[PDB]
Inverse folding.
């Protein structure tokens, strides 16, 4: 009873939001490493080194 | 659980303080009417109207 159910709610609420954000952050970081969709023969690269 | 035991405590706390104050207020007010302790021949009022 040291704290209202509301407070604990708001708390666990933010906690979930965070846990969410981190997972999304993790995924984007991982993608800074583009990978090969399939096995095959790759050709000319349309994008150049250092392009946007 | 809508509110902490602490809050309800502080609440009921003030409530008691109030109830206390009122009772004391009541008593002082009551004492403003100076009544005679007994019946009989009273004498000179060794105190004049307006005097503290």
């Amino acid at each position: 009873q040291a704290v209202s159910k509301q407070q604990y709610a708001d708390a666990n609420a933010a906690y979930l939001q965070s846990k969410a954000a981190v997972e999304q952050a993790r995924i984007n970081l991982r993608y800074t490493k583009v990978l090969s969709p399939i096995s095959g023969r790759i050709g000319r690269s349309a994008v150049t080194e250092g392009a946007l």
